[PDB]
Scaffold this motif. Structure first.
Motif, short mmCIF file in Angstrom:
data_model
loop_
_atom_site.label_atom_id
_atom_site.label_comp_id
_atom_site.label_asym_id
_atom_site.label_seq_id
_atom_site.Cartn_x
_atom_site.Cartn_y
_atom_site.Cartn_z
N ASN A 76 1.13 -1.05 -0.15
CA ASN A 76 -0.16 0.08 -0.03
C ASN A 76 0.66 1.50 0.05
N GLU A 77 2.61 1.19 1.16
CA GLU A 77 3.05 2.72 0.74
C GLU A 77 3.93 2.88 -0.35
N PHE A 78 3.85 1.82 -1.22
CA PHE A 78 4.65 1.82 -2.43
C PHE A 78 3.37 2.32 -3.29
N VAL A 79 2.06 1.47 -3.37
CA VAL A 79 0.85 2.51 -4.45
C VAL A 79 1.00 3.54 -4.13
N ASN A 80 1.11 4.16 -2.76
CA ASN A 80 1.03 5.55 -2.44
C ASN A 80 2.13 6.54 -2.91
N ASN A 81 3.51 5.42 -3.47
CA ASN A 81 4.52 6.75 -3.11
C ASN A 81 5.43 6.58 -3.96
N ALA A 82 4.23 5.58 -5.38
CA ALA A 82 5.21 4.97 -6.71
C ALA A 82 5.62 6.65 -7.61
N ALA A 83 4.51 7.46 -7.52
CA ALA A 83 4.64 8.81 -8.74
C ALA A 83 6.05 9.85 -7.88
N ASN A 84 6.74 9.65 -6.71
CA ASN A 84 7.98 9.94 -6.53
C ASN A 84 8.68 9.57 -6.08
N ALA A 85 9.36 9.62 -7.28
CA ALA A 85 10.98 8.78 -7.28
C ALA A 85 12.22 8.91 -5.86
N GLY A 86 11.96 10.13 -5.34
CA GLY A 86 12.30 10.13 -4.27
C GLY A 86 12.57 9.45 -3.26
N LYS A 87 10.85 9.79 -2.87
CA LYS A 87 10.61 8.08 -1.56
C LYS A 87 10.64 7.02 -2.79
N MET A 88 10.56 6.93 -3.66
CA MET A 88 10.72 5.30 -4.54
C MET A 88 12.10 4.52 -3.90
N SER A 89 12.89 5.43 -4.07
CA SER A 89 14.70 4.93 -4.01
C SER A 89 14.73 4.71 -2.36
N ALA A 90 14.18 5.30 -1.33
CA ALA A 90 14.48 4.78 -0.28
C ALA A 90 13.55 4.47 -0.46
N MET A 91 12.05 4.04 -0.31
CA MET A 91 12.18 2.32 0.04
C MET A 91 12.68 0.96 -0.69
N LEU A 92 13.34 1.77 -2.20
CA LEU A 92 12.79 0.74 -2.40
C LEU A 92 14.29 0.04 -2.29
N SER A 93 15.14 0.89 -1.86
CA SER A 93 16.38 0.05 -1.31
C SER A 93 16.23 -0.11 -0.03
N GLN A 94 15.40 0.19 0.96
CA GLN A 94 15.30 -1.02 2.21
C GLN A 94 14.05 -1.88 1.70
N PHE A 95 13.28 -1.76 1.24
CA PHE A 95 13.04 -3.24 0.93
C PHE A 95 13.83 -4.41 0.04
N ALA A 96 14.57 -3.60 -0.68
CA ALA A 96 15.59 -5.00 -1.01
C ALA A 96 16.71 -5.67 -0.06
N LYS A 97 17.10 -5.04 0.23
CA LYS A 97 17.91 -4.70 1.29
C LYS A 97 17.39 -5.94 2.39
N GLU A 98 16.09 -5.79 2.74
CA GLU A 98 15.57 -6.83 3.41
C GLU A 98 15.07 -7.72 2.96
N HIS A 99 14.79 -8.05 1.92
CA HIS A 99 14.85 -9.29 1.19
C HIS A 99 15.76 -10.06 1.04
N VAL A 100 16.87 -9.07 0.29
CA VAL A 100 17.95 -10.22 0.05
C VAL A 100 18.59 -10.65 0.91
N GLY A 101 18.47 -10.77 2.17
CA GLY A 101 18.90 -10.82 3.96
C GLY A 101 18.08 -12.17 3.69
N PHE A 102 17.56 -12.08 3.29
CA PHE A 102 16.52 -13.32 3.72
C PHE A 102 16.06 -14.69 2.54
N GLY A 103 17.78 -13.74 1.64
CA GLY A 103 17.12 -14.99 0.12
C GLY A 103 16.51 -14.35 -0.19
N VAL A 104 16.05 -14.00 -0.99
CA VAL A 104 14.96 -13.39 -1.72
C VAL A 104 15.57 -12.66 -2.92
N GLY A 105 15.15 -13.70 -3.84
CA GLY A 105 16.33 -12.31 -5.31
C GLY A 105 15.28 -11.72 -6.17
#
Ligand code: HEM
Ligand SMILES: [C-]#N
Length: 146
Positions: free
Chosen positions: A72-101
Motif C-alpha cells: 500500500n505504501e509503495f502504491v501511495n508513493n509510486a510517483a515520487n521517485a524520491g521516496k521510491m528510491s528510499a523505499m526500494l533500497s530498504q525493501f531490497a536490502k531487507e529481502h536479499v538478507g533473507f535469501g529472496v531475489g
C-alpha cells in the motif's frame, strides 16, 4: 518511479483490493504459493508446508498483512521517485538478507494483474503501471546483489 498518471491508475486498481485487506491479502499469498510453489520455501514459517497447511496456519495473517501494508505504501508513493528510491533500497536490502531475489519478484509480477482482476476489472493502463512498479522492485533487488 511511475508518472502521476500511471500511479493514479495503479491506485485505482488497488483500491478495491485493499478494501478487504485481510481476506485479499491472505488470498494473494495463497495464489502466489499455488502458482509458484518454490516461493514458500523462502519463508521459515511455511518451508515444507503444503498450501492446505499454509491456509490453516495461524501465521498467515501476519505475513499477508505485512505485504499488504507495505505494498500500500509503495502504491501511495509510486510517483515520487524520491521516496521510491528510499523505499526500494530498504525493501531490497531487507529481502536479499533473507535469501529472496529478483526472480521471485518476476514471479509476483507475472501473477499480480491477474490477481487484481480477480477482485475487480482494472481500468485501462493499470496492468502496465503495476508491471512497471514491480519492474522497479526487480531492479532494486538486482542492485542489492540478487
Ligand atoms: C509482493 C510484495 C512483497 C512485499 C510488499 C513484502 C514485504 C515484506 C516486509 C514488510 C517484510 C518484513 C520486514 C521486516 O520488518 O523485517 C518482508 C519480509 C520477508 N519477506 Fe517479503 N514482501 C514481498 C514479497 C516477498 C516474496 C515474494 C518473498 C518470498 C518469495 C518474501 C519473503 C520474505 C522473507 C522470507 C522475509 C522475512 C523473514 C520470513 O518471514 O521468513 N517477501 N517482506
Ligand atoms: C514477506 N512478506
Amino acid at each position: 518511479s511511475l508518472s502521476a498518471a500511471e500511479a493514479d491508475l495503479a491506485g485505482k486498481s488497488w483500491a478495491p483490493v485493499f478494501a478487504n485487506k485481510n481476506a485479499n491479502g491472505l488470498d494473494f499469498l495463497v495464489a502466489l504459493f499455488e502458482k509458484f510453489p518454490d516461493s514458500a520455501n523462502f519463508f521459515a514459517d511455511f518451508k515444507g508446508k503444503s498450501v492446505a497447511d499454509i491456509k490453516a496456519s495461524p501465521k498467515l495473517r501476519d505475513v499477508s498483512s505485512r505485504i499488504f501494508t507495505r505494498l500500500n505504501e509503495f502504491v501511495n508513493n509510486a510517483a515520487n521517485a524520491g521516496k521510491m528510491s528510499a523505499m526500494l533500497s530498504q525493501f531490497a536490502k531487507e529481502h536479499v538478507g533473507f535469501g529472496v531475489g529478483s526472480a521471485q519478484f518476476e514471479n509476483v509480477r507475472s501473477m499480480f494483474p491477474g490477481f487484481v482482476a480477480s477482485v475487480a476489472a482494472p481500468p485501462a493502463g493499470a496492468d502496465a503501471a503495476w508491471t512497471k512498479l514491480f519492474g522497479l522492485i526487480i531492479d532494486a533487488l538486482k542492485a542489492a546483489g540478487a
